[PDB]
Amino acid sequence: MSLRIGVIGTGAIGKEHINRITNKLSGAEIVAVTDVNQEAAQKVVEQYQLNATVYPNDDSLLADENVDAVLVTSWGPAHESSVLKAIKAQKYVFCEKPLATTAEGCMRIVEEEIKVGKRLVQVGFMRRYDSGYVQLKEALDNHVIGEPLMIHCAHRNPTVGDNYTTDMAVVDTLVHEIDVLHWLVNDDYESVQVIYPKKSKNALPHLKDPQIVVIETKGGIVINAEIYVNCKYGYDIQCEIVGEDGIIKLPEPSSISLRKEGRFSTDILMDWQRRFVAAYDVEIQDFIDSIQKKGEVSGPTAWDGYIAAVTTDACVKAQESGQKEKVELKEKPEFYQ
Amino acid sequence: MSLRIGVIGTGAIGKEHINRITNKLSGAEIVAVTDVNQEAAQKVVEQYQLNATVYPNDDSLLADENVDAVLVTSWGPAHESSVLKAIKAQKYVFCEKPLATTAEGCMRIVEEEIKVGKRLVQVGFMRRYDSGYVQLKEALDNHVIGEPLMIHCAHRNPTVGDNYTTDMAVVDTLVHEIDVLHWLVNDDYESVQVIYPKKSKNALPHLKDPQIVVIETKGGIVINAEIYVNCKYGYDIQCEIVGEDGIIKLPEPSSISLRKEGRFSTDILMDWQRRFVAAYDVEIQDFIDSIQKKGEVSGPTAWDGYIAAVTTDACVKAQESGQKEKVELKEKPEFYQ
Amino acid sequence: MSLRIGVIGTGAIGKEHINRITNKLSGAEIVAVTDVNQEAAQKVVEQYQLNATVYPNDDSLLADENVDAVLVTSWGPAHESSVLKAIKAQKYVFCEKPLATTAEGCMRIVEEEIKVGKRLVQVGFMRRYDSGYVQLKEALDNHVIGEPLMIHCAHRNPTVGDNYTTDMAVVDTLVHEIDVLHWLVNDDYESVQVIYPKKSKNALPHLKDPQIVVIETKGGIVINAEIYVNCKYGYDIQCEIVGEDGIIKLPEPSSISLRKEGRFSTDILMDWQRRFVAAYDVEIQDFIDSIQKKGEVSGPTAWDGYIAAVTTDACVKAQESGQKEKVELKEKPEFYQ
Amino acid sequence: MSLRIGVIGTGAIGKEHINRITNKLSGAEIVAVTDVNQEAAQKVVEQYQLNATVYPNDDSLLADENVDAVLVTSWGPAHESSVLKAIKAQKYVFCEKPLATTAEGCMRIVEEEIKVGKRLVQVGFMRRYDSGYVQLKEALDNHVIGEPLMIHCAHRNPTVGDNYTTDMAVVDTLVHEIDVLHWLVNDDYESVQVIYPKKSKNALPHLKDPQIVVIETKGGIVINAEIYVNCKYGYDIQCEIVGEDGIIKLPEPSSISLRKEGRFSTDILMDWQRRFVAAYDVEIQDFIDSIQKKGEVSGPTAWDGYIAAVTTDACVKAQESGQKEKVELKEKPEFYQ
């Protein structure tokens, strides 16, 4: 009895999710796809020899009685809408970042779910399923290094397109950090300062690259997060956590050592795609399994997607300001703990 | 249209394969299990809420028209039989090591398959699917380090039971090495010497632990393989390959670094189970996908399982001998390249 | 014929310099000493079998004509006095940090040296002589990573004394990073800013530990240095330089690796005195050789000492004001390049 | 008052020892020299501004009473002669390897020293003074890993000369491992065995490269050492000791890490002369200090030199016979412990 899923947005990342659910994972199938380009979606269907149905809009897809859950994997803007609809049609929703582009949009979604009595919304922040980040979580829950104090993390890309803009650095990129970091330390943020180092020769005129983002939490944990998307050497994600009595750090992605031409080296990835492939699979499978076994979702909540929208706003504010912007959060609803 | 698989031997490792095919992988289901303990198998069926059928023997299971393929995952001895039967009943067979306990048993199986026109037998040497070993293969096929010359590998266990015996070191353990090594370098062995170092205090009286196994191939590649199954510190698999112009080495299993009490450390596994979990999943999935897409299997051939049986014999011979035993191989049949 | 050296201040560090100059290095000897505790000076001479005069003060010792260079290694606040005297006596001087406790104190010393025509003052910033830091310098000077953009570094101690106070973290501790960083990147500081994270249980109540000091050069390089003098795990110096096209990082001190009880570890030093023992040796040997083979000192200059003093002051400001303070330096007199 | 040292053999290595004793170390000077090329000896004295007598031979130089210790650093085969003379002249002698080219040559030197009552001979096996090897020793002496059982080690050169021949791999190259290994584990060798892998394209036709030398101590420790003098990638010394309850390994030389163009690398040395520069310095300084503070040399002994010679012979046997040769040592005269 496989979970029947409908995909809203046959994008490039929606093409991935369709393929893994189809050819890698267990206990689910894609039966409905809807795309703004109805000829683009119609190609994705013959591609993976799917046995699905193409809809012009989400309404018609959500109206289908086959679909039990939906993958909201289209443009960032077109999320908040598709989501609220799904909650009302009472389907399960896996929503890829962002939950909603506006901190208030995520607030509407919260209220809706709080009504439906249970949890339908899971946000696609995959890092939480990555074994690296999991080991960190494990170590922290065990008090291995006592109380966390500071966190040094980086997030680097070989290069970007002419479409990448200063705000995208804290919106499409630093977003995962913002998500997983607070999950790990179990703390809410508070302030976000932004500091622009000497600009890189690799970055385009309209872009501010690199950037540094300091972030304090209510507890007093200080996080400086480097964001450099034109580093050139590769795609690299670093995270070190200094504690009271010890330090734990995120591993490098497994590689074979090589001794040649006077150097002892490992390999650095070049494609953000390769870095977290395993995390997606574990992610979706948890979505499926959680629905079939518990009648609800389990991953990153809709509240977290809102914590994302707030924080990711104070950051874009400090990008122009240059001052210690504030992060203000509505109290956590009982519904979520 | 999922591949319908029958499991011969609801062992501990047969319990794993059933669970992954059921709850992790894609496009297949277990519909038949047979165990020598018909009450043991009957528990495995209610366990994973399977919708299968229990058979007293393989004949009755192989006679079932549901099953398309079989997992031969019972005692080592009870393999050769179950396999030859499956080849004759014309089912697909995934056979966990050993292919057959006797170098001639594997020879019977080869001949049968050579008749059935295509490939039905895939041997469960999972290391070939491990990304570490894959990266090595990749590097070698690219001539990164020119011509291989020597190989230094180790294989260590924290401890063993009173059931582990001197021959098991080269039969149940060094077997994977023997398999993957020749696959990597694309060469046939030739001689196997065995050298017993000072015996460990951790090993039991009847056991010779550790052991070292030198192995030459027709090309002139020298392999010294440490085998120490009472190392105590953990479960560790090492493999370094010296070439003409460089050296490549197998990575450690990903872990988080820790700075505490004057030491900078990573974690060493304690359970052989954890080391290759991913390799099994990729393995079985390849079995399934290969059958559905190509009408045959793809993994480690039955010939390789025979190359295993021969080599793993010369080793047990050098264990008593103390001399440079010989490895004699019947020419490779056209069927296999 | 060896360089005849007088030591002002025969404490713990003065004794170590006396010992290395006497039993390890080459081309120099101690002919004169003097300490505030004149009795303690007399013991040193016996302890080390010196052939030296024991003067009552620095004026007397500097008066001795058979001494041609002096080591100022006394109580911090006393340094400034002896250095001025030594310059006017026209002797070579190696002064441990601080050169002087105030920016003014340093200016008086610079202005005195510029008179005497050549370099007589070398400041004991030994990190410049450490093999790791030397390598970083070589890479940067070879444009290996293009233009430096950011710097992440840490300075950690297992614990401190009851006497250790909040301001000491920037005046005694961070002072080495302050010197080496701008030396490495050849850029002057423009601003500093202190950020306090959650206090550590390991730090006594009066001490503010850890700290985070953010510093910007004029060129736009953004440094962020972590000071944690109660980290427990050990004594640790980390430094990472992120450039345009690549990243370079300071090495760990050499250690054998251990595989035992589940961990794969290396050692971490506990005693700060073992970390740079080789840099001190090279530092002093350079003071000697550079004199007998150039007629002037070579290492860190009186001006560098001034830079340190100013920046140190700016940090103590930023400390107690939680503000972004400016680092205002007088024009670098061409006498220094 | 310094130790007055005469240098027999003023070649490349004799010059380096002359240089360190003159411009780096402490408590000694060169007062006499002599070379087969007497003209070359005269140049050294000018080159290094020595205050030394230039004798025509070792007899003359040993006759000089104002010299009290000598460095034998001449053409290998000449060593034995000078060492015997020096002993009978009752001077302290530091002899570079070999102590003598034959086991008999070494015996004559041992038998001469046992007469003169105390230790005058220290052999230049500098590895014992390397900080890495010193750490391994400390761990073993502290039973950190229990009883040593096996040893894997490698000795690699980028390339060699046209003059380098097959036997040199065990007499010149493997001779350092031969000395340090039995020193580390405090056990005597019992047998050796050579195994040749596929020749390397980098090795000229006349040379047999790489090689594998298997050695067993009396206690049962099984060493296996790889010699590859044409590895191309660099100069590399690796050593791993597998004990009962754990494993310890020699560190890489210190290097900064680099993240660039897809690789995460450290540096590998090319020049063998940079690998042990610190061990030489400590080695000679110990020859000096140990004399003026004990009245006898301390390091590797004439007996150790004998052990080396015997084992070296056994290897050249095992080389050309492809046999498992025995290592027969005379009883260790109690004069040596």
Ligand SMILES: NC(=O)C1=CN([C@@H]2O[C@H](COP(=O)(O)OP(=O)(O)OC[C@H]3O[C@@H](n4cnc5c(N)ncnc54)[C@H](O)[C@@H]3O)[C@@H](O)[C@H]2O)C=CC1
């Ligand atoms: N977490 C991660 O690492 C990644 C997730 N994403 C996220 O996924 C979303 C889109 O993925 P991408 O492939 O990168 O972009 P995409 O542009 O290829 O996906 C958008 C596609 O969906 C369709 N679409 C847009 N709005 C729609 C609507 N209201 N209804 C139906 N179809 C609609 C469009 O035709 C377009 O082809 C974005 O929100 C992005 O932030 C993107 C890349 C990676």
Ligand SMILES: NC(=O)C1=CN([C@@H]2O[C@H](COP(=O)(O)OP(=O)(O)OC[C@H]3O[C@@H](n4cnc5c(N)ncnc54)[C@H](O)[C@@H]3O)[C@@H](O)[C@H]2O)C=CC1
């Ligand atoms: N590659 C790997 O890492 C691993 C594979 N294995 C292999 O799997 C096989 C058994 O797995 P284990 O769980 O370790 O042992 P196991 O003893 O638990 O499995 C044997 C089970 O199958 C049943 N059985 C035996 N012969 C049978 C037959 N002819 N027909 C039906 N059922 C039969 C027995 O009742 C027993 O419960 C062995 O060949 C072993 O070498 C074992 C462990 C790991």
Ligand SMILES: NC(=O)C1=CN([C@@H]2O[C@H](COP(=O)(O)OP(=O)(O)OC[C@H]3O[C@@H](n4cnc5c(N)ncnc54)[C@H](O)[C@@H]3O)[C@@H](O)[C@H]2O)C=CC1
């Ligand atoms: N740059 C560097 O890496 C290092 C520099 N230092 C600094 O150097 C100074 C010396 O440190 P320690 O030797 O540990 O000091 P210490 O406290 O162990 O003893 C200093 C000695 O100098 C004597 N002294 C004080 N004032 C004097 C004067 N006007 N004339 C002559 N002698 C005088 C005192 O009697 C005392 O015996 C300290 O200020 C310290 O901060 C310390 C360690 C390293």
Ligand SMILES: NC(=O)C1=CN([C@@H]2O[C@H](COP(=O)(O)OP(=O)(O)OC[C@H]3O[C@@H](n4cnc5c(N)ncnc54)[C@H](O)[C@@H]3O)[C@@H](O)[C@H]2O)C=CC1
């Ligand atoms: N234990 C160790 O780590 C090392 C030891 N050695 C060994 O030490 C020896 C010296 O090497 P190099 O200095 O490179 O030699 P070299 O070839 O550069 O020159 C040796 C010099 O000694 C002179 N000489 C030869 N016979 C002599 C005699 N009977 N009396 C006085 N002088 C004589 C020669 O004229 C020549 O100038 C070699 O045999 C070498 O194998 C070499 C390097 C390191």
Ligand SMILES: O[C@H]1[C@H](O)[C@@H](O)[C@H](O)[C@@H](O)[C@H]1O
């Ligand atoms: O989808 C990925 C991912 O979100 C990473 O966090 C980001 O750095 C990559 O640039 C992006 O392409």
Ligand SMILES: O[C@H]1[C@H](O)[C@@H](O)[C@H](O)[C@@H](O)[C@H]1O
């Ligand atoms: O099943 C595993 C595996 O075959 C390993 O190769 C072996 O070393 C382990 O001991 C065994 O339990």
Ligand SMILES: O[C@H]1[C@H](O)[C@@H](O)[C@H](O)[C@@H](O)[C@H]1O
């Ligand atoms: O003298 C040293 C040095 O100043 C180091 O920078 C400091 O961290 C050590 O604790 C101190 O003892």
Ligand SMILES: O[C@H]1[C@H](O)[C@@H](O)[C@H](O)[C@@H](O)[C@H]1O
């Ligand atoms: O003198 C050294 C030393 O003997 C090393 O063992 C050898 O590998 C070097 O190549 C040689 O130059």
